[PDB]
C-alpha cells in the first residue's frame, strides 16, 4: 500500500486549492493544511521542506463523498479559495475540516451539526481551525441560526434526511446569494428504498428545480460508494458566479 514516508510529489489540481499527490505506485488527493502538522482524525498528512512550515493532508474518498465526487470528476464545485461555504451535515467535521482547508484563512465555513457529541468533535475542530464556525442545531429550522449565518455562496449538503429537498430549499432561500452554487449528496436508499435509484435521482432533481434551482451536472460517485449521486446545481440563474 501507500505506506508512510514515501517520496511523492504534489501538483495542482484543476480546482483551486486541491492538489494531487502522485508518487511511485500511488496517486491520491490532498489539500493544504492550515494548522500545520496536526492531524484531524489520524488522517495521513504530507510534509515538505521548502527552500518546514507547509504541510498537506490527504483525504480518503471512502470517507468523504466530497472527495469521491472530485475523483469522479465533477465540473466545478464552486468553492474557490475565498468563497463563503455553508455546510449541511457536519458529521463530526472530517470533510468539514477538508473544506475548511480548501477555503483557507480568508474564507469561511459555517457548519450545521444536530447531534451533540458529533458536535463536540465539531467544535473541537473549530477550536483548532479558525475559519470554520460551528452551528449545532436543527438544520430543518434555519431560523435557528439566521442570526448566525451571513450570505454564503456555496452550500454543500450531505444530510441523510427524507425531506432533503425542502430542507435545502428553505436553507437556500435564507442563505444563498443570487447566483448560488450548491452540491448535494443523494443516498437513494435513504430517500426511497423501493425505487430504482436513477429515478430517485430524477425526482430529487425535479423537486430542486421546483425549489427554483437549475441543475447543471450530476454523477454517480460509483466506485467509491453504492447508490449515491452527487448533484451540482445553481440557485436562481444559469452561469455560476455573477
Amino acid at each position: 500500500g501507500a505506506k508512510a514516508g514515501k517520496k511523492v510529489i504534489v501538483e495542482p489540481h484543476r480546482h483551486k486549492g486541491v492538489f494531487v499527490a502522485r508518487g511511485g505506485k500511488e496517486d491520491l488527493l490532498c489539500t493544504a493544511n492550515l494548522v500545520p502538522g496536526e492531524s484531524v482524525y489520524g488522517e495521513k498528512r504530507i510534509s515538505v521542506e521548502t527552500p518546514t512550515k507547509t504541510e498537506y493532508r490527504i483525504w480518503n474518498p471512502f470517507r468523504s463523498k466530497l472527495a469521491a465526487g472530485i475523483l469522479g470528476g465533477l465540473e466545478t464545485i464552486y468553492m474557490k479559495p475565498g468563497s463563503k461555504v455553508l455546510y449541511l451535515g457536519a458529521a463530526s467535521g472530517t470533510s468539514v475540516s477538508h473544506v475548511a482547508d480548501i477555503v483557507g484563512p480568508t474564507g469561511a465555513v459555517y457548519a450545521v451539526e444536530f447531534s451533540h457529541r458529533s458536535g463536540r468533535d465539531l467544535i473541537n475542530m473549530a477550536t483548532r481551525r479558525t475559519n470554520v464556525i460551528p452551528i449545532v442545531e436543527d438544520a430543518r429550522k434555519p431560523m435557528a441560526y439566521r442570526m448566525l449565518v451571513p450570505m454564503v455562496d456555496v452550500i454543500f449538503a450531505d444530510v441523510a434526511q427524507p425531506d432533503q429537498a425542502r430542507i435545502v430549499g428553505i436553507n437556500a432561500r435564507l442563505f444563498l446569494k443570487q447566483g448560488g452554487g450548491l452540491l448535494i449528496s443523494i443516498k437513494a436508499s435513504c430517500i426511497d428504498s423501493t425505487a430504482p435509484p436513477e429515478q430517485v435521482f430524477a425526482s430529487e432533481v425535479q423537486k430542486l428545480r421546483e425549489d427554483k434551482f437549475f441543475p447543471k451536472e450530476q454523477l454517480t460517485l460509483e466506485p467509491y460508494e453504492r447508490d449515491h449521486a452527487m448533484v451540482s446545481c445553481v440557485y436562481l440563474q444559469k452561469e455560476f458566479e455573477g
Binding site: A195, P196, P197, E198, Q199, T220, E222, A229
Partner: protein
C-alpha cells in the same frame, strides 16, 4: 449512465414513467382510445 447494462435498462420497473408526444396523443384520441386504460392494457403495469 447508471443502471445501463449494454443497451438494456434494468431500472425500468412499474410504475412506468412514460412520456407523451403530441402526434401520439392526437392519433390516440383520434382512435378513440382511453389513454390510461389502453396504457395499463399494453403494459399490464401501473403507469404514471
Amino acid at each position: 449512465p447508471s443502471s445501463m447494462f449494454f443497451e438494456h435498462n434494468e431500472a425500468l420497473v412499474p410504475p412506468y414513467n412514460v412520456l407523451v408526444d403530441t402526434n401520439f396523443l392526437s392519433r390516440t384520441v383520434g382512435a378513440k382510445l382511453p389513454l390510461l386504460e389502453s396504457a395499463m392494457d399494453c403494459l399490464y403495469a401501473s403507469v404514471n
